[PDB]
Amino acid sequence: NQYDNDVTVWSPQGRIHQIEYAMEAVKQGSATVGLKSKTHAVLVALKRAQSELAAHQKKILHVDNHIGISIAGLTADARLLCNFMRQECLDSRFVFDRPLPVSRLVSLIGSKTQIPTQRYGRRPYGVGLLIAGYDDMGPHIFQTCPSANYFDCRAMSIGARSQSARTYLERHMSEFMECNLNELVKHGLRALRETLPAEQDLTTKNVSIGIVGKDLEFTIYDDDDVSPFLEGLEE
Amino acid sequence: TTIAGLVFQDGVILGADTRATNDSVVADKICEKIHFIAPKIYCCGAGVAADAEMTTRMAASNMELHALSTGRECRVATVTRMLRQTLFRYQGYVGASLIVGGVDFTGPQLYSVHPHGSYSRLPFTALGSGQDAAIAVLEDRFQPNMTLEAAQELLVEAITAGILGDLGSGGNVDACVITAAGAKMLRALSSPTKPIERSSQYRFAPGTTPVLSQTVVPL
Amino acid sequence: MSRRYDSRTTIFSPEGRLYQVEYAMEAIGHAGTCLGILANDGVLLAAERRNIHKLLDEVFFSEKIYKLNEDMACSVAGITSDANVLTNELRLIAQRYLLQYQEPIPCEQLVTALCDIKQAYTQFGGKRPFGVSLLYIGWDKHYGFQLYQSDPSGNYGGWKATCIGNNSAAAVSMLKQDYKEGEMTLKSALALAIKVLNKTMDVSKLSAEKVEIATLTRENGKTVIRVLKQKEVEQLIKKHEEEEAK
């Protein structure tokens, strides 16, 4: 009714509906999934094309050698945080000559996300961010929210039709830690199967992935190297 | 330029001479020095001419604002914290030198302000170019809590010793007598120069000037 | 903040006009009746005083008539508060002109300078517009004797004769009928103001105290402005007093 106009107005139940609808816009778009083992972490992003003539949108944004992120939500809203996140990672190596820790970066990104919220007139960021990274303590999977909340997860699936995907992730979570880089991609791609209906399932064309590891810097694969990753797996 | 001040039992008195000079010649014979702030508080400046003038007038307006706003009469210790914070902000670049004193409900208080912004409380002081000549008589001949009329003639001897001593002190000598009951100003208090006359009388009749053009503007 | 209470003057009506400006012209019509006449020998200005009471004083030179500068003057009908704002801004623009060119500002230049400031608030800023309508008189080196009328929307224009405030439709109609273009001068045309001010005022027996008259004429290379003597204006009304009988 009259409580949905802006962020500052609180509902009589103590809820901000603009932040609530900010989480709704994240469910309105492509579903991405990511997971981490004791060594390697993989981010599986689902690329979607509006038509067959138009190509697939880019859901992966390269951050640094040790850090990468996938975006689910309003498309262009991630561009502002992208150039900011890249600038923060460069400033870390520009001063400390050291890559910024993964947990410290997300804490700084969650700060810039929360600042415009309480201040009237500034629109909250309506895109969700699934970011991964590797450090001396191993890989990390950090899922964020438009409310600026961010967690630490072994595996997480966000977006539309992520219900059956999360159920698959929970039962197989015990394997996600002990599997090697090859098996992480396999079960990671089969987790993306539940995010789409029974007609269109998965192809190497519309599905891209990225990986980070112990001695391996974050890389991005789209079609060529992804074809042997998908094939050889039962669904 | 030499100004002086002193503290007596019931109040303070600030002495000054009348002569202002452009550091080569005498600019004015009768030029006044002592300024006005409050009914119970008057001040006198020294050092740079205009820097002392504007500084006292800018502080005198804030005293009237504080007076009427509080409904209470002005305080003497309040004056200095206005002055120095304005002068110290300029870091002594302003050559204004001020000897400030007055009477409040607490009692007689006589301060002094150097161009760098320093302040000190004391019964008597003198500043200016010829200060050291006038400070001598003041430091030597002062007694604690002297009689009012005894301190008046003491100030007359003070600046008089600074007149012959310095090339910047001359003309007449006036003082400002401020008391706990009220304030008073004495003009033409000391007239050391008696030779103001003219020997030869010269009356130049019209026509001795080679007139060229003439025009008149009516009103 | 509370956009609920924001009137947004910059919004156009569905008829393609401004809300505040349209209501500003009506507020001017409620003000007193003021007229002006541009003649050969100079400019003529007369203004009614709608304030009538036995306790009034008016220690100033005039109520609705002000002096802009040496060579120019003005009248006012509208909100009395916003008039002092425009009067000060006219005195600022005219004197800042004297800095650069060291010459008196022409009549047309000073008028168009404030009208840009008037409508600047209707263009942006969110602040309410001005409800003041001003008449302009004076002399310049080129165009000479000039008479100008301004509008709250910022629009203006030259006028040989005009009227502002109450009774605008009746006065201007009565003005044109007997108005002599480039012919009837101060002396004669001064009788028209008294004749018009008596018709515009609904209360009969027009009083010299209820009206005010000021003229500006440059003579012998010097601009002369004065407020006419009420004792003489009474005799100037005594003329109109004997006009209906003879």
């Binding site: - | - | 924001d6 393609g16 047309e108 006028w159």
Partner: protein, 232 residues
């Protein structure tokens, strides 16, 4: 300060504020202009004053420079700000570049202002549409029309203000190579372009002309009647 958006979108996509701005453009007086062969001619109707106004301030045909002049139809308020700040650009362009001003260069900077005023916070779109016309290098004339929205076009013959579409119907039908052949036929076309929207107006038509190297020249009322005398 005052910071908020003024012009916002609609469920059908059209702009409420901008359409009401162009509505006030049509509510103004009818102004016309054409691009002649060797010259340019502007004209605008005059609402008939009764034995009062002075024509110095009322004149709606101005000149931004010796090369380029302009006319406007709409609210007289916003017209004077554009004329002033465009003349500043004309002198600023000559200050920056020794070469004279270009009609296309000055025109775009004008309409660009109205685009800024539309998308700026707290500003307002103007209710004016101006015809920018002048001479380019080698003597090639150019006629451009502005828009409150900030776009600008090129026109061989143009009409603005009230009944702009009505006169445009007379334009497109009666504009041929026979039009704007000579300085006389160019002026007579501007008069006839003002004869459709005129109701018992008569002498109210005022005209202006710019001839080659010379700057904008105002035709005297008797010189106007000379070309108006021929109708039938």
């Amino acid at each position: 300060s005052y910071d908020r958006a003024i012009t916002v979108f609609s469920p059908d996509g059209h702009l409420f504020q901008v359409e009401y701005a162009q509505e006030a453009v049509k509510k103004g007086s009818t102004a016309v202009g054409v691009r002649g062969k060797d010259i340019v001619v502007l004209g605008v109707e005059k609402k008939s004053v009764a034995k009062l106004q002075d024509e110095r301030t009322v004149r709606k045909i101005c000149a931004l420079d010796d090369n380029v002049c302009m006319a406007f139809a709409g609210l007289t308020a916003d017209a004077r700000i554009v004329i002033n700040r465009a003349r500043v650009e004309c002198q600023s362009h000559r200050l920056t570049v020794e070469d004279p001003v270009t009609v296309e260069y000055i025109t775009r900077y004008i309409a660009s202002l109205k685009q800024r005023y539309t998308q700026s916070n707290g500003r307002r779109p103007f209710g004016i549409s101006a015809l920018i016309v002048g001479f380019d290098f080698d003597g090639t004339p150019r006629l451009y029309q502005t828009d409150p929205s900030g776009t600008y076009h090129a026109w061989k013959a143009n009409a603005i203000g009230r009944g702009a579409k009505s006169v445009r119907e007379f334009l497109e039908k009666n504009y041929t190579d026979e039009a704007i052949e000579t300085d006389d036929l160019t002026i007579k076309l501007v008069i006839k372009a003002l004869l459709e929207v005129v109701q018992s107006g008569g002498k109210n038509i005022e005209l202006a002309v710019m001839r080659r190297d010379q700057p904008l020249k105002i035709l005297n009322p008797e010189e106007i009647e000379k070309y108006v005398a021929e109708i039938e």
